[PDB]
Every structure is written in structure tokens, then in C-alpha cells.
Amino acid sequence: SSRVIVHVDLDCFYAQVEMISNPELKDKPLGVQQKYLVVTCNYEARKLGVKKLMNVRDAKEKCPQLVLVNGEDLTRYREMSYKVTELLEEFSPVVERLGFDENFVDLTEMVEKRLQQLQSDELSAVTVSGHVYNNQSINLLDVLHIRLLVGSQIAAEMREAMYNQLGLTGCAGVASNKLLAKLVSGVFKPNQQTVLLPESCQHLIHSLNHIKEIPGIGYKTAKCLEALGINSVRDLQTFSPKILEKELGISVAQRIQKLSFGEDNSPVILSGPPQSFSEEDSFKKCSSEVEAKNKIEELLASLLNRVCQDRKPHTVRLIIRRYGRESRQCPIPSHVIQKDVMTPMVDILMKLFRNMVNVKMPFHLTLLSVCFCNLK
DNA sequence: AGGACCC
DNA sequence: CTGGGTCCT
Ligand SMILES: Nc1ncnc2c1ncn2[C@H]1C[C@H](O)[C@@H](COP(=O)(O)OP(=O)(O)OP(=O)(O)O)O1
Ligand SMILES: [Ca+2]
Ligand SMILES: [Ca+2]
Ligand SMILES: [Ca+2]
């Protein structure tokens, strides 16, 4: 029935990993760059008007003193990311990854184990770690309040372990489901944690200013709702279900309307090892098959260095962008799976390549990616 | 093969 | 000119 879920959210992740590489970079305003953008920056740099996905042009004019590090190669971020997940997995085996720097953990059985280990006189001694959302009053005879507080204590232990063992700093939110844990984790940042008591749930969801701030509502869904005059959380909460189902489908409608009330019963899913892995690169222009072939050889070479890992891929995919995306995939021959690997995959990929683009007609590629999936 | 979503 | 991921239809 009732759950205790934690959402762990690392502060300025890439920037943070960079500062643990050469500590010297600490105290100095830092940006991590990918091509022409600062994808994330530390809190020093952020204070001076800098923010994520803001171009170097709009980033150097506010901070001529902005320091830039190249973060196109995700290798070290990916490795640290899995170290965080593994350390969280020690607490409870059910950990779900969301991108490289967020994890949900279902702390329910863990909370329960801790409580039944306590005695009656110890119950009254239970205290919160970190913030309580909305400064809401704790009631120690409320069993839900007690469970959530034990949650906050486990969350603090997680954050202390991450810091002591990995040198990483992060936020956590403790709440009754994933949506709410994720909404609450960011209330105090960086490097703090907040617990959401059930009485403050409506306050948390109405504190949002647009429905696009609801996790699960992306670009397409938001713009759709905007085309129906739905702007605030309360609008979505009170809008006609039937009309909603019509315009977006039964699945999306009922789910996201449920989310507008802070209700989310989706389980925390054990992520385990990844289901795919890819190497990607983008560029102003690719217009020759020989250019493409070389980039593809680069991506594949790098990708093969990772294909060792934990399992082998049985499918390969190639994606391109032009001017959404386009792609072709096919199985990987079993003698190739049995592991010079480079020669036939390139041939495989180029055939895949010619399937979408024809050599003897003009074309302008802006992105190339190779993906290994269907792993066994 | 493409859609939607996440960081 | 970002670099990756997830599941669904
Ligand atoms: N279009 C995008 N929308 C959202 N996130 C993106 C997008 N493109 C890339 N990202 C990724 C790249 C970075 O890893 C990350 C950027 O910062 P983010 O994950 O939101 O938190 P952060 O760790 O960088 O800082 P913090 O969480 O403390 O605010 O999101
Ligand atoms: Ca986040
Ligand atoms: Ca973060
Ligand atoms: Ca959203």
C-alpha cells in the first residue's frame, strides 16, 4: 500500500566530477562545454548569471572569467554515475536510474525493518534529518509521519556515504511516491534534503507554475495542453477527462491527470545494467560518404571499447539527423558476436547508411550515432 | 522505425 | 554543431 520513496539528485553533476579530478578548479567559476554550449556549470559560475544549455557566447559575455572544460566525452561521468547507483544499491537493491545523475530508491521495506527494531519508548525519539517541506508540523503518533522521518534518516545516510566514499554531494527528497520525491528533492539545493508530509502534498503540486513542470509532461504534451487552454496544475486537475482522453489518448490523459493531483503509483524499477549503449557526435555539416564513413569508424571504435563490459549485443542501430531523427538497425551476425571486428561492422553500418541517404544526391547530416542494443 | 518521455 | 538514456505503438 503506502510507500517511502527517495529521489537522489547530484549537484551540478559534470561540473562536480570535473572538480574532483583537479580540486584546483574548486572555488573557480566553472562551465562544462560540449561543442558550442555550456551544458552545466558549478554554483560559483551559476551565481554570475550563467546557466545550463546557454551558449558560450551568452556565457562568456557575463563571465569573461568563466572557466571552460570539455565534457563531450561522457566516459568519466558515466563511470561515476554507475558508482553512485551501486552505492545506493547497497542500501536497498531496488534502484531506478533516471539519466546519469538521478536515482529513485524504494525505502519501504527498509523503513519497516528499522521501525520493528525499535521499542515503544524509542518511537517518541524519532527525529527528521534535513528540511520538512513547507515547515510542516510533525506528528509522532502519525505512523505515516514516522515512516517518512525514518526515510529522511536513511536519505541522510545515503548522502553521507556518497560524500565520504565518492566525494559527491547531492540533494534528496523523501515522499510517498516517485513524482513527489522528485518534486520535493529540489526544494532546497544544493546539497540539502527535504521530506514531504502528506498534508503538504497539495501545496507542493500547486507551487508549480506551469504543467510543463510536471515530470512526465514534455514538449509535445505541454504544447497540446496549452492549445486547450490548460496552463496551471489546477486547470489540468479540473479539466474534462473525456475531452482530455480524446485529444491525447486514454493512456496519457488518465496518467497525467492523476499526476496533476500528485498521484503516481508507478513502481520503482530495478534499472540494473543498461539496455543499450551508444556513441554519438554532431556537427555543422556532413555531405560525403567518406566523411560519414570516417565518423562512423570513430564512433564504432569507441563503442567497441565499451562492448566488453558486463553480455553481448545482437543488434546494431545507426541514427542520423538532417537539415526528428532517422534510423536503421539490423541483427549482428553471430560469428561477429563471437568475439578484427571493425571491418564487417563498418560494412554493415555503411549499408545501413546507404539505406537512408543516397550517395549520388545532395545531403546534409548534422548527427551520427551508433547504438548497440538487444544485449544478452 | 518512430513516437513520447528523462537527464 | 550537445550526449546520452528509457519504454510504447
Ligand atoms: N535538453 C535537455 N533538457 C534537460 N537536460 C538536458 C538536456 N540536454 C542535456 N541535458 C542534461 C545534460 C546534463 O547532464 C544535465 C544538465 O543539468 P541537470 O541534469 O538538469 O542537473 P545538474 O546536475 O547539471 O545541476 P543541478 O541538478 O544541481 O541543477 O541535463
Ligand atoms: Ca535533476
Ligand atoms: Ca542534478
Ligand atoms: Ca516535465
Side-chain angles (χ1 to χ4, degrees), chain A residues 127-142:
Chain A
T127 63
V128 63
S129 299
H131 301 268
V132 177
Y133 178 78
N134 198 26
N135 187 36
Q136 179 195 332
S137 279
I138 299 159
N139 189 334
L140 296 181
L141 307 176
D142 192 326

Side-chain angles (χ1 to χ4, degrees), chain A residues 9-13 101-102:
Chain A
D9 197 343
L10 287 164
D11 302 324
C12 59
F13 182 48
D101 81 344
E102 289 181 36

